[PDB]
Amino acid sequence: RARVVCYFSNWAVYRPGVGRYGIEDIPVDMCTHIIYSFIGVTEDTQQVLIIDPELDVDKNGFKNFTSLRSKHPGVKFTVAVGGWAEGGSKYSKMVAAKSTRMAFVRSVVDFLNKYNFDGLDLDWEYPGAADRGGSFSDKDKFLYLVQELRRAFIREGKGWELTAAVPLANFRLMEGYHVPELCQELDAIHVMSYDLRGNWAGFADVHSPLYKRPHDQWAYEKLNVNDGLQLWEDKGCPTNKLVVGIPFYGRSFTLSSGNNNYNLGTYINKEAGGGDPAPYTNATGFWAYYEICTEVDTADSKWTKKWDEHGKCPYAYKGTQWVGYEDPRSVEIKMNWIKEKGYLGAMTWAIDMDDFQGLCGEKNILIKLLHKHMSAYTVPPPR
Ligand SMILES: N[C@@H]1[C@@H](O)[C@H](O[C@@H]2O[C@H](CO)[C@@H](O[C@@H]3O[C@H](CO)[C@@H](O[C@@H]4O[C@H](CO)[C@@H](O[C@@H]5O[C@H](CO)[C@@H](O)[C@H](O)[C@H]5N)[C@H](O)[C@H]4N)[C@H](O)[C@H]3N)[C@H](O)[C@H]2N)[C@@H](CO)O[C@H]1O
Ligand SMILES: *[C@@H]1O[C@H](CO)[C@@H](O)[C@H](O)[C@H]1NC(C)=O
Numbered sequence: 247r248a249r250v251v252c253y254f255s256n257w258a259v260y261r262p263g264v265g266r267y268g269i270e271d272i273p274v275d276m277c278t279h280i281i282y283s284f285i286g287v288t289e290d291t292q293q294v295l296i297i298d299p300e301l302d303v304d305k306n307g308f309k310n311f312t313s314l315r316s317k318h319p320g321v322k323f324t325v326a327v328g329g330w331a332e333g334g335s336k337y338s339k340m341v342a343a344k345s346t347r348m349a350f351v352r353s354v355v356d357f358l359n360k361y362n363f364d365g366l367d368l369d370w371e372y373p374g375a376a377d378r379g380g381s382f383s384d385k386d387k388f389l390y391l392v393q394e395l396r397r398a399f400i401r402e403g404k405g406w407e408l409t410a411a412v413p414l415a416n417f418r419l420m421e422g423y424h425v426p427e428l429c430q431e432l433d434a435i436h437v438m439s440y441d442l443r444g445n446w447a448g449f450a451d452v453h454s455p456l457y458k459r460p461h462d463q464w465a466y467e468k469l470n471v472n473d474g475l476q477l478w479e480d481k482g483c484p485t486n487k488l489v490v491g492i493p494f495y496g497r498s499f500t501l502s503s504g505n506n507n508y509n510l511g512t513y514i515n516k517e518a519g520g521g522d523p524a525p526y527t528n529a530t531g532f533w534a535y536y537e538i539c540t541e542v543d544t545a546d547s548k549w550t551k552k553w554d555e556h557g558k559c560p561y562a563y564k565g566t567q568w569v570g571y572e573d574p575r576s577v578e579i580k581m582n583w584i585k586e587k588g589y590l591g592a593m594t595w596a597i598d599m600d601d602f603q604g605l606c607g608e609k610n611i612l613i614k615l616l617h618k619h620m621s622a623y624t625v626p627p628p629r
């Protein structure tokens with residue numbers, strides 16, 4: 247009854263060579279819930295925006311995805327609206343009034359019916375965030391949207407799921423999320439317990455530390471997976487609604503010139519924007535798990551791999567390059583911690599970045615860990 251929630255990126259199919267990952271590559275039986283990412287919202291009409299129509303519609307992307315339920319009827323196939331690239335301003339604008347919310351709600355219902363989805367994952371990042379086109383009134387109005395969506399889903403009578411991806415920083419929770427009311431309306435809370443550190447922070451660190459490190463201070467003091475999930479509990483979310491995010495990727499850094507200190511918290515060349523782009527994801531500061539293991543784990547690797555004794559995460563470095571991530575050891579530790587705490591399950595960003603080709607060893611090594619632990623785990627009643 248535990249969840250293994252797998253986010254699927256629709257843009258992964260455009261990755262070159264062995265990086266190419268499509269619908270056919272999803273290891274469906276390893277997941278209980280799979281989420282097609284992303285659709286968006288229109289700026290002008292507050293309707294569902296199909297972001298890659300040639301792929302999603304013309305090449306039958308949405309339907310290929312949902313029709314996987316024929317072979318795997320026990321699995322839920324939903325769609326995510328929002329995501330980082332979508333921005334937050336269109337969503338703050340959409341929830342501003344009742345009329346615009348209901349226009350979106352109607353569009354959502356039409357979309358879900360048309361492409362046979364089992365429900366919707368809300369990924370607005372984030373309500374109430376000034377840095378993301380939000381404002382104070384987003385907190386109330388995001389709740390209104392969620393309540394209105396739930397009632398519409400009930401009226402359709404198909405038992406659709408409604409979930410949300412959420413941050414874990416206290417200031418983000420205060421600005422955007424009525425926790426008790428939201429957790430009541432939602433089937434699951436997908437906590438984005440990653441990207442907690444990165445180039446934007448101005449120092450090298452692992453991005454999903456489980457526990458606090460000595461160097462964690464001020465805003466970073468409770469910015470770890472354990473304290474972050476505890477925060478969601480303390481604000482009123484039941485343990486059996488919380489799903490813990492696991493990143494299948496690393497946040498990389500370019501160290502400052504002449505810096506021979508590779509410890510956690512060491513200064514970086516922030517202007518570089520992060521570590522150099524990897525060949526398949528081609529993104530500064532962002533390396534897929536398979537891009538990391540093919541570099542760090544090889545027999546003649548010149549990378550030095552270390553372990554965060556407090557955060558329970560691996561990091562590795564070579565020359566000016568430094569990356570923090572998750573490996574089988576850290577993932578296993580998090581799986582046991584999830585069961586220890588009694589949370590609803592595990593979530594991954596994203597399934598397309600596991601070692602699905604088995605370049606470094608066994609195929610889909612990370613998702614197999616999530617499946618192994620969660621499938622043998624019974625979610626206890628709310629604490
Ligand atoms: N919810 C959070 C997540 O959002 C977040 O993960 C991020 O999600 C966003 C989407 O919200 C991702 O943004 C996408 O990034 C893609 C790649 O970076 C973009 O797609 C590509 O865009 C490229 C530039 O145009 C194209 O490059 C071409 O590639 C060609 C191959 O055919 C090549 O021949 C050519 O030379 C290139 N021009 C490429 O075609 C295209 N697919 C996409 O536009 C963009 N929306 C983001 O990548 C991702 N990190 C997550 C992690 O922070 O956290 C979650 O909680
Ligand atoms: C959907 O399935 C068809 C038939 O296998 C295939 O031709 C097409 O490429 C698939 N579309 C996507 C986006 O995977």
Ligand SMILES: *[C@@H]1O[C@H](CO)[C@@H](O)[C@H](O)[C@H]1NC(C)=O
Pocket residue numbers: 523528529
């Ligand atoms: C890789 O990313 C860079 C910077 O965004 C871009 O200029 C280039 O077109 C990308 N290369 C490929 C192969 O897509």
